[PDB]
Design a protein around this ligand. Structure first.
Ligand SMILES: CCCCCCCCCCCCCCCC(=O)OC[C@H](COP(=O)([O-])OCC[N+](C)(C)C)OC(=O)CCCCCCCCCCCCCCC
Ligand code: HEM
Lengths: 55, 431
């Protein structure tokens, strides 16, 4: 809170943090895509997709 | 360089050449694999094989004659080679096999022995001749459900179900007089041959015409014969080309010469004046490739074939090759065209004038059957030299630019991308 209750210090720091997190999410999305890339997507049959891929 | 051709009751075509040592005589029919059905497919090839059977072949060997036959798409030919003096004895063997023995060659002991041989023959082809196998399937998919789709050697299933009656039925419908041309090459004169022919009368099935069909058509498509056990990938890709007797017959053949053929192991081949070579040699995208402009009666195919062990870069091979072809519509240079003219003449010469009369017969026969005459080698060169960059561009902009393609391949073709990816490369983005 930065004080006795939710006040000015609180809202100002929450805006600063609201601006920051989306960029951390962006970095996490890249890590998400990196893990996706090494094994590729799965498919509705639940089996290997290695025998028939399309670009 | 003489093209003489006259008609009495039968159409006689000859091309005499003084020094030759030997003479070749034969009949060429205006019907081939393109006239067969999906079910009697392979009958023509079967005919060729009995004509060369040990029995019929031994009868000609005693007389000192050599036999040769060729089954194509638009035509079919039976040739007998002999010394310049025995030019009459070749005609005796020709008539004796197409009228007298046109029932003795079809014996139940000869037919079964021959059938068993063409079966092991066609099987061996499908099992090992990958480049031709692929080229054959290219015609199969490109011209599906149309005359040009049928393979010349026939299919194993249509062959093993073929009987003596099928041979006869085909022979009585196509080996007619109005669908034939007697050809003579070597050294013998036109007047020397026509006399021996007009001597022996007897028409035998005259006035009879062969059956008709439906016109051939190109269909953009593909057939993928994946086989990961093969050590390479063999592919053939093409667009609808030019039929024989087409105004652009030569423009097309020149266009194919621009990219020509290649062999990565031959030092001299790596040095050719072909821009595409700068791209493919860096990572060695292929062992070999060769462009072609196949022409037939109703249609043709213009494209290339290639073989490669670089299985993870097949997409670059196809991409660089198609980018070069894009150039024909927008930026082909004067010197590329000029280089092609010179090389087209050299190859066209080496074909039309070889030291083998049997090749001459096939070339002469096939031409006269379609246009009723043969264009002289000197006449061709005049047409070739007359081609301008503007001609090639107009041709390419009609046949190559943003046009459907036909693809066929076998071996390790996992790296050959989908149809649409290849098809998209038939053009370029522009403002
Ligand atoms: C987020 C919201 C964005 C909305 C905007 C939508 C994009 C507009 C879609 C219009 C497509 C325009 C077009 O024709 O794009 C063509 C390129 C060509 O891609 P190509 O592979 O080189 O061509 C193959 C197909 N051709 C071009 C031969 C026909 O194909 C492309 O590059 C299209 C990919 C567009 C990706 C965005
Ligand atoms: C901002 C959020 C996210 C982004 C941009 C994102 C993006 C992607 C993309 C592009 C794919 C591939 C296409 C697809 O399968 O839809 C994918 C796959 C996947 N994602 Fe996400 N993702 C996000 C959040 C999440 C969350 C919250 C979960 C799970 C708690 C998750 C689990 C997965 C899994 C398991 C796959 C593989 C699916 C499969 O192939 O079967 N993702 N994601």
């Amino acid at each position: 809170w930065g004080g006795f209750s939710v006040s000015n210090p609180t809202i100002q720091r929450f805006f600063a943090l609201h601006y920051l997190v989306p960029f951390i999410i962006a970095a996490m999305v890249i890590m998400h895509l990196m893990a996706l890339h090494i094994h590729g997507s799965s498919n509705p049959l639940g089996i290997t997709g290695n025998l028939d891929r399309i670009p | 360089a003489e093209v003489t051709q006259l008609s009495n009751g039968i159409v006689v075509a000859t091309e005499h050449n003084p020094s030759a040592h030997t003479a070749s005589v034969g009949v060429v029919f205006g019907s081939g694999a393109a006239n067969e059905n999906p079910y009697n497919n392979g009958v023509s090839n079967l005919w060729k094989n009995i004509f060369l059977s040990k029995e019929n072949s031994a009868v000609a060997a005693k007389e000192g004659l050599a036999l040769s036959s060729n089954i194509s798409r638009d035509f079919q030919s039976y040739i007998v080679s002999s010394l310049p003096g025995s030019t009459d004895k070749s005609l005796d063997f020709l008539n004796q096999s197409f009228i007298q023995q046109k029932a003795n060659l079809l014996s139940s002991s000869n037919f079964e022995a021959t059938k068993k041989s063409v079966l092991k023959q066609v099987q061996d082809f499908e099992d090992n001749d990958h480049p031709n196998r692929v080229l054959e399937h290219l015609h199969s998919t490109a011209f599906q459900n149309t005359p040009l789709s049928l393979p010349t050697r026939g299919t194993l299933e249509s062959l093993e179900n073929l009987v003596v009656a099928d041979l006869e039925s085909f022979a009585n419908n196509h080996f007619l007089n109005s669908n034939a041309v007697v050809v003579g090459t070597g050294n013998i004169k036109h007047e020397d041959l026509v006399n021996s022919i007009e001597s022996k009368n007897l028409s035998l099935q005259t006035g009879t015409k062969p059956v008709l069909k439906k016109k051939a058509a190109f269909l953009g498509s593909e057939v993928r014969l994946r086989d990961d056990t093969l050590p390479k990938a063999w592919i053939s890709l093409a667009v609808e080309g030019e039929p024989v007797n087409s105004p652009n017959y030569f423009v097309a053949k020149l266009a194919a010469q621009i990219f020509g053929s290649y062999n990565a192991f031959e030092p001299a081949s790596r040095l050719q004046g072909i821009k595409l070579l700068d791209n493919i040699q860096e990572y060695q995208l292929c062992d070999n490739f060769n462009h072609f402009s196949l022409s037939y009666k109703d249609s043709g195919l213009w494209g290339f074939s290639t073989a490669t062990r670089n299985v993870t870069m097949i997409d670059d091979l196809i991409h660089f090759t198609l980018k070069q072809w894009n150039r024909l519509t927008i930026s082909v240079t004067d010197t590329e065209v000029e280089r092609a003219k010179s090389l087209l003449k050299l190859q066209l010469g080496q074909l039309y004038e070889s030291g083998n009369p049997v090749n001459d017969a096939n070339l002469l026969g096939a031409e006269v059957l379609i246009k009723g005459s043969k264009l002289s080698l000197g006449e061709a060169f005049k047409k070739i030299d007359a081609i301008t960059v503007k001609d090639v561009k107009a041709w390419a902009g009609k046949r190559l630019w943003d046009q459907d393609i036909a693809i066929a391949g076998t071996g390790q073709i996992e790296g050959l991308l989908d149809y649409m990816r290849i098809r998209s490369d038939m053009s370029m983005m522009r403002w």
